[PDB]
Design a protein around this ligand. Structure first.
Ligand code: AWG
Ligand code: AWG
Ligand code: ZN
Ligand code: ZN
Lengths: 360, 360
């Protein structure tokens, strides 16, 4: 059975389990069970399942080189699928809440969940909470007697927290650190002094790389009982690297991918986000180019957004992006080679992850 | 050392631990560490610590009758305090998010966290997320080698989920179940057919009783390694009972306690909440009284709110409340007596819980 089919079948399984448990133990009625079923489908399905499928792909790699009974192989695959869905649901939580936080309009070519007529923000904040609770309900149900449950929960926990810290880094990224104060309304930075590579790196590392790369990779290792096939420091480094590159890609696409292929009208410029484009532009701009960026960035006026987009195109950031990508390729290949010392199999799963990231 | 002092000292300890860990492992800067420190203080401190202190009180009861080394007594108390704070932080999460969900204005005589000038909803949704993540960071750090950690996490998890299900029961309580649909904007009920005791009971049981009574009681038992001193079905029943009574009390206070003692201007009438007042009024009203309730409930117009408050006073709900309270006293005393069979000590902790609830 192909990996995708198996992963989707487990969705249906987990969904049925969660809805049936709500009826048998949480006194739910059928209409609310329905609403929740539709919330789950709308918020968790539709993407490429890159995260959840990474878990499955890492486990498939170990299965190919490890002696197991058939029933054991099926168990391990089922665990990987469940683990995968945990990470997908974790994502779904973050996306629902982030869309609300940011007043976003669309996500994947459909309206953000909170904008559905019969949802609203008052329900959507809670639906997002439920999404994350379901990760834990799944884990405790499917993984209760598993040797890895402790390590899996502890890692999951740390990643979730990292992700929320990262969200804070991100939503504050256009404030001046020295002025942050719950008592005082926050002005946008005027100097852009904190739009640096180190700062940008910190935002992306927490907000995306831990849940998008490190969690799927390590979860594949845990459900495989293979975390001692690998050097964990290397897993982190490669995760953080490919993860930053995934986010530079999304930053570039926010600005330049037309909205039909992006699945939304990007608003990083209007929102004054600390993007790779902005940091890189500021790292090469002359005094006049800086001054004009400052007059136009972080304002809703489309004329001003167009001045920023012009500045970017004429600063030839395409070239900086090629250089960035070349350096990431060097470093990723290097880390893969290092991974081969203790696990050729895991190194190859990491190669596959890199390839899928490179080609999206 | 008195229980309150010990509980507050552990706050400072846990806070220092969380902030120091953010700096050493999450690359935080001092200004964000500050912001988070102030968020934690503002959202977690200021109440009566009823929940967290219940954990401590249950553990103190077992300490008085169980032979332990001094260092073991101190460990158990420290665990209870940490466990207590978990539940307080869980509360703080729910309060931040609920205030946002509901567009609430005040909480405990201060502005809701999201309304602080330098917070805003975009940050506050995430700060609430962080609040809940901290419960898990505390547990894993202080409880990593404890025999009860598995049971404690699993219970915590189930209670959190119950609480989020309850929130959904509550925010939907003025819709007609048969019309819930994410695709269709939700009309307020016109018949009030779902304003019944059973339905009301379901809302309160999930939204409040699990995190306010069941969690503190059971967590005291777990950090005491005493869950086999008790009949768990009885703990649940007593929790659900005293818990419903706590919420009837809050419902009555929403309507009739003046805003300076309540700490906010209650808006259950404007919000069309399924309150004990509304259910009870509907259970005794004549046709004309029902018709007038329906013309006035769930509307912001203060004239209309005043008609609802008049209907309530003139329906002499004071008497229904006395009867309700008398029946809860019968049932609570009964369950305490049953609890005495296996644990006189735990029965007494439950007696103390009841007394504090009765007198607030
Ligand atoms: N990572 C990052 C993110 C945002 C802005 C700057 C950087 N740092 C960086 N170092 C490089 C070394 C060679 C090529 C490109 C490079 N980019
Ligand atoms: N619990 C509840 C909540 C909201 C509305 C009704 C009720 N049920 C009920 N049964 C009683 C038996 C004697 C006295 C009062 C009573 N209330
Ligand atoms: Zn965002
Ligand atoms: Zn509420």
């Amino acid at each position: 059975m192909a990996s995708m089919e198996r992963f989707l079948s487990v969705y249906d399984e987990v969904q049925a389990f969660l809805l049936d448990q709500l009826q048998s133990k949480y006194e739910i009625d059928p209409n609310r069970a329905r609403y929740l079923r539709i919330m789950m489908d709308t918020t968790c399905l539709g993407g490429k399942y890159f995260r959840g499928m990474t878990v499955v792909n890492v486990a498939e790699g170990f299965l190919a080189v490890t002696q197991h009974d058939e029933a054991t192989k099926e168990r391990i695959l089922h665990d990987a699928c469940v683990g995968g869905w945990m990470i997908e649901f974790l994502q779904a939580h973050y996306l629902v809440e982030d869309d609300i936080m940011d007043g976003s309009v669309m996500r994947r070519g459909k309206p953000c969940w909170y904008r559905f007529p019969g949802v609203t923000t008052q329900c959507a904040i809670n639906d997002g909470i439920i999404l994350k609770s379901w990760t834990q309900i799944m884990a405790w149900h499917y993984f209760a007697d598993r040797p890895f449950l402790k390590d899996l929960l502890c890692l999951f926990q740390k990643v979730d927290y990292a992700t929320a810290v990262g969200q804070m880094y991100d939503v504050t990224s256009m404030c001046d650190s020295n002025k942050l104060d719950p008592e005082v309304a926050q002005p946008m930075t005027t100097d852009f002094a904190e739009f640096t590579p180190a700062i940008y790196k910190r935002i992306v590392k927490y907000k995306t790389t831990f849940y998008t790369y490190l969690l799927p990779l390590v979860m594949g290792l845990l459900v495989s009982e293979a975390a001692a096939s690998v050097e964990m420091n290397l897993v982190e480094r490669v995760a953080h690297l490919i993860g930053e590159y995934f986010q530079v890609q999304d930053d570039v696409m926010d600005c330049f991918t037309p909205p039909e292929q992006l699945g939304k009208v990007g608003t990083d410029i209007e929102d004054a986000k600390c993007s790779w484009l902005a940091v890189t532009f500021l790292g090469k701009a002359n005094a006049a180019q800086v001054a004009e960026f400052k007059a136009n960035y972080g304002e809703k006026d489309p004329a001003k957004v167009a001045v920023v987009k012009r500045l970017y195109s004429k600063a030839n950031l395409q070239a900086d992006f090629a250089a960035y990508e070349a350096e990431v390729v060097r470093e990723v290949e290097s880390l893969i080679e290092q991974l081969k010392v203790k696990s050729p199999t895991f190194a190859e799963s990491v190669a596959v992850v890199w390839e899928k990231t490179h080609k999206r």
